[model samples]
Target: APQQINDIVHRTITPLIEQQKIPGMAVAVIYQGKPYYFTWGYADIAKKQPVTQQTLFELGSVSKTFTGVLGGDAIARGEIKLSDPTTKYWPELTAKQWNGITLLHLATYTAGGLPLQVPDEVKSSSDLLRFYQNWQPAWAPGTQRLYANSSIGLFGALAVKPSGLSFEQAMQTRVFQPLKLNHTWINVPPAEEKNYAWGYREGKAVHVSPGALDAEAYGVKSTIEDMARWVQSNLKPLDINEKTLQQGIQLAQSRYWQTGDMYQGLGWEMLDWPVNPDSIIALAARPVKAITPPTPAVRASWVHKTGATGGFGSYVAFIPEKELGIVMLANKNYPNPARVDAAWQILNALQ
Candidate 1:
């Protein structure tokens, strides 16, 4: 059985490497709460460093999922409420539109309108806050879903305001510490620098440098071992034994909105199980757009998120009912269709 699974996973990723679509990749399949892993190609081609389960990769926007989990923790512990106005905590956001924006709006990317990237001029936290002060939404809050990092960054900042801890400190104390996620970090600790895989940008080695709001946006770095633990915790969060941590994971995975055929949970997307690979690929290829008000899903589905930066790409998907999860991380950015297809194939084989 192990050999059969290995063959299936090997077949799924081999062609991509052969075609030079990805320089290297680290994959982990969480079958029934256990991890079976595969690492292929090189972490550094010139140095000839091969990727291992311990190799670290930029999580890209998949980091947003962690932001959502932090929000869920605050909401569950009564530090904040989903319906509470954003102005309640960050009163500095003086725009008239601030009154209408709720914590949920930010978490769901429905705070009217925010561009995919912050302007280059916004080089510091003070600059970002000033930008928001004059910011006016194109539409009323909660009416549209826009994929935005600015909204989440602001929300993450405010979500921790009550705790009097910086966003990084809050995440460490609230999520990482309780869950024992030692391998995950917003800033890769110095000792782990060797494990951080360099990104191949335009065929050269580079690292994704931190910028303003990076912690709240695309800043998480983690290894396969830590991600496997994260998946397992999501699969059985109640097993955490800590009430707040359990509540956070539970609320984070709960569906909060519906856009077209996709359902939005905190930071993940939910879709009916047994979905076709072609359909999944099509969804990934389409541009982001707003949809009608939230709708309920009828069945247990796979919850997933895909993320990318200039030089790296990552994907995470899990079906809670089956206790099945998969994480794919690569140094060279790969297309969404390839990532989805590989995960879909593995889930199909498990069933």
Candidate 2:
């Protein structure tokens, strides 16, 4: 099975590496709750360091997957509520003087029309709050979906309000630790710096550039080894010690909203197997163009999310019914469709 997995991975990633010019790529597959890893190319092209299961890659918006689980766990523990008003955490927030927005809107990307990122002037949390206070949505809240870090980023901040920890601290304390991920981090420490992959942008190396809400929105760096654990937890949170946290992982995976064929949970996106990466909503570092029409959803779909930084790209997907999960990490900011294509081919081969 391991050799078969290797053959399958190389078949897809080999051509992908050459075609995409990805400096390095790592993939982790979980079949029946066990992990298998494969790697190709160099973590540092100039240095010739190989990508490994332990090599850390920035997970961009994929960080929201962790944040979503945190929010769900908070809700399971009675700390965060979907229907709760935004003012519950920010009474000073007087967005359009409207009180209709709720936590659900934020978690599900239905916060009317929050931008894909915070406005340029929002350099600090206080600046963000003032932006919220003075803001007005392009449309009525909950009526449409506009994927934005502004919403989920704020949701992550408030998700741990009861613990009095920053979003970064709470993620480690509440989510990563419980998941038994020793290597996952929003800020990769100095000691582990050697394991971190330098993303290549136009032949120059780079890492995640810090921004307001970045920690909450799109700032997780981790390894395929650790992400395999995340895949395991997403498949079955039963291994966790905290019962509420286990339940929170369940909530995060549950389908909360359906927009056309696209299903939205907290941070994850759901689609039927054989996904067309070209058709994906994010097939955006900035604001998305339009909302998919609402439709009834089937719960049994391939649950997944994609992430990227200036020089890194990532995609993760799992099918709970089959106990199958796959994570692909690369040190180049490439197209989502190619990632999806390579991943789908491997997954289809596994079956």
Candidate 3:
């Protein structure tokens, strides 16, 4: 385990983010249901605020993990059915083409056909009706892999229709509150505002930029400490009942479909059975553009998710078989950051 973890950590820190000029990074690794943390650089440059376990960073698409978890919670509460179509709860999806689109499809990123990003018109809308009324897909649903976040956000938000709570409130009541994740936040709270880490841009730290849309497509901020809690949930999942844990793990790690050699889940990437150089896979089912898989075959199974935006980049991954979890978040968005790949290298090297 030590050798494996060392290899993984080495892979994680191979100057990849530095090469891309990322300003700061924070990572938390869990082993056998315990956590190990590593960090470098600053959270606030002018004030010389060093990144710490409690320093908050935006999570980008990694927020989808929370979205998925919340979705699971909704399922547990019987608020929504995975098999239901989007238009069932939100009639705004009046397009006949979307009738076949299921919540499962949106959660799995295979809902018929859709673009990867939401259109500017959708983003500009103040409500769901306006958002979908003008929207049209380039292809039929479930046709191919486009990694549509717009669809995900809408799907996640729509969960509220059945759950009777807003996305942020649901997270607090069902997920965050139960977990006691103090430093983790969705929409920023007034009192906790001081702890927020500003993002960097063009080689300089920037603080005043707006966060992404609140939908699950991309929006979360967390600390390494709380992230470790999230990793622990994935690694051990002991707090939830055995049935829920089993089902959640199964859903999260299930190989929903293939994109090239990659296998994707509802919101995760599952590696091959025998394990290969690359431990983390995505819904796309292929290695990310230029990144290559690792060389050795690993015995344990691994699952992973990654996200990035103007202010942040993040990756969360875990090996359920070995009780291992790795969560890494960065304050500065890498124009060409390699933090996640580096973290995977370290992960492959160490555990």
Candidate 4:
């Protein structure tokens, strides 16, 4: 695990990348205290620009992990208690169901009855607020789970309210700054207009998601190098007692909600990496396999989050116990975010 797995990993990944015709890929893996990076294919197919560690890819919903970090930091600062009602910050919500929902409910995705994505009519963030203001949800607060960005986006606003700054500014100042993830911004910067990664559609390029301007749900864009550092921080922290480090990791990894075998904690998903229903149950019942999956034995539990926008697809996951992490950013999305099969092949061959 201290060495590299480039040959073993590349053998599998190179072909998959070629076969799928996914134009560009950036991957960063850290295992046993060492980091390995791979940049394959082209960033801009038209220009024949090769992918690099510094190539910025749209982070899509993986930005929610940043959201979780801000929320936890707010708690540490006593800005917003998890129990605070959504009304406390966004009183514009007029629906009765929105009344009982608390900040925790939104972060945990237990905001009783919410849709995963809004209808086309509710196009913008402002439109979303209006919809929530009039919409009536069926389930009681904190009951059934629905993974909706509306809940998370609202949670994002509540978390930043205490800092007396916009969520976009708070994230840039607190989370991204401390972690040193350069080129990662909720709002695309005008200075480095050329550095931006173009989103692709049906194998052709497309515009960035119109909804991405709202940093609460999706907005982060970063280079593989910066995200790799984030992957490391989530692994065993160099300084464990630091308040933000401790609380942020705990909050993101804490198991607060369950659906059948899979569990969600804050903004991340805790899954048995191979993602088999029976294997998950067996591992849970046995407990011995909890730290390691069946045959691959990754030596740590799988903690992950995925993001997708009009032209971008992104994923990041690391096992805190083993100090191992893997991140993949692609210019074109291939529908399934479980790029795990591709990512894990590299992880399996990891030294």
lDDT of 1: 0.81
Give the higher-TM-score candidate: 1 or 3.
1
Poorest lDDT segment (10 consecutive residues) of candidate 3: 285-294
TM-score of each: 0.93, 0.92, 0.84, 0.86
> Where does model 4 exceed 4 Å of error?
1-4, 118-128, 238-242, 272-300
Q: Which 10 consecutive positions of candidate 4 have the poorest summed lDDT?
A: 281-290
lDDT of 3 by residue, 1-351 (tens): 355565555455546556756667778778778787777777887888887777888888888877777776676567787778888887756767677788877776666445566655444435546656556655555556667676677667876667678788877777776667778887777787667777877666654334224556677788999989887776655565545433554455555566555665656666753456443322342222211222222225567788776777788877777676788778766632255456555555545
Cα shift from native, residue 13, model 4 (Å): 1.6
- Order candidates by TM-score, high to low: 1, 2, 4, 3
In model 4, what is the error at residue 282, expressed in angstroms?
28
How far residue 123's Cα lies from its native spot in candidate 4, in Å, is 7.0
Q: How many backbone clashes does candidate 4 have?
A: 2
lDDT of 4 by residue, 1-351 (tens): 223466755676678677667788888888775677888888788877788877888887888888887887787777887778888877777667677788888886677655565565776658868877776666677667667776787788778877889888888877777777777877677885576667788877765555522577777888888888877766654454457745665666666655665666667777655444233210111111121111221225677787887887887877666666788888887655247666666665552
**lDDT for each residue of candidate 2 in 1-351, tens digit (9 for 90 to 100):** 588888988888999989999899989998878999888888888787889888999999899899888998888889878789888888778655448888888888877777787866689768888877876777777777888888999899877887788888888888899788999999999999989999999999999887888888899999999999999998877778898788778777766665666678889888765555455554122232233343322345688899999999999988777778899999998998898888778877775
Clashing residue pairs, candidate 4? 1-351, 61-307
Cα miss at 339, model 2 (Å)? 1.0
Worst 10 residues of 1 by lDDT: 281-290
lDDT of 3 at 99: 70
For model 3, the stretches where C-alpha displacement exceeds 4 angstroms are 1-14, 120-127, 207-213, 241-250, 278-300, 335-337
